[PDB]
Each structure stands twice: as C-alpha cells, then as structure tokens.
C-alpha cells in the first residue's frame, strides 16, 4: 500500500529500510517531451506527402 518504505526478503528472514530517492521529475518531463516530439514527428509525417 506504499504507506511505508521498506522491502522484505524471506530467504534471509529480514526487512530492509532504504532512502527513497525523490523521483527526479527531470526524467518524467523528459519522457513527456520525447513523446510529444514523437507526436510532432507524426505530424511531419502527415506533411512531406505534399513533397
């Protein structure tokens, strides 16, 4: 349920606490930008049929 940051391993019978890095919005902005550049690339593909 993500209410608590940690990870189990039964093979060692242990739970582990980590540092949860702050997602780094740069990469999400990057993905949205490249996806929208893919959209504009399809737009240019709609063009260039007029040659």
């Amino acid at each position: 349920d993500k209410k608590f940051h940690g990870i189990l391993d039964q093979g060692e019978g242990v739970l582990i606490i980590f540092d949860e890095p702050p997602v780094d919005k740069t990469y999400e902005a990057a993905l949205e930008t490249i996806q929208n550049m893919s959209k504009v690339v399809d737009s240019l593909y709609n063009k260039a049929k007029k040659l």
Binding site: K25, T26, T33, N36, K39, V40, S43, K47
Partner: protein
C-alpha cells in the same frame, strides 16, 4: 588603457574552473526541461495548423531554439568543468 580597464570584468582562472552549484544546476535543468515541455505542447498545435489559412515570430519555434541552446550549453559546460576538475585536480 585597453585591457587595463578590461581587468574589471576579466574572468579569473578560478572563476573559469568554478563548478557552479550542482543542486542549483539540477534545479535549472528541472525548470528548463519543464518549460521545454510546455513549449513543445503548443509547438505541436502550431505544426498541426500547417494548413495555410491566411498566411501570416511569437512563441514556439524560436523560444524552443533559445531554450535548447541555453540548456545544452549549460549542461555541456558543467559536465566539461566537472570532468576537467576530476582528472586534473588529482
């Protein structure tokens, strides 16, 4: 008198090898990429109105140009300064 006065804005060598600030640089890239996304959003509309009603420099194209230019040069110079500092300073 030339380059006697210029010493006033003359960049120092430590200023040249200064590595800026990594947290601030990450904030700068964070803001500029988001602005890039918001510019590309309407750049898509601009390219989707390619139909040439009433043939008409505001918004998407050159703004995207200046953004990519400044972002790319800042990132390149920061990486180069970091690398030079890494290899030369020990």
């Amino acid at each position: 008198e030339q380059k006697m006065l210029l010493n006033l804005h003359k960049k120092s060598w430590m200023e040249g090898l200064t590595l800026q600030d990594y947290s601030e640089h990450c904030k700068h890239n964070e803001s500029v990429v988001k602005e890039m996304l918001e510019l590309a959003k309407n750049y898509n509309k601009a390219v989707e109105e390619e139909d040439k009603m009433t043939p008409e420099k505001q918004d998407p194209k050159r703004h995207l140009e200046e953004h990519v230019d400044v972002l790319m040069t800042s990132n390149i110079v920061q990486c180069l300064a970091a690398m030079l500092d890494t290899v030369v300073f020990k």
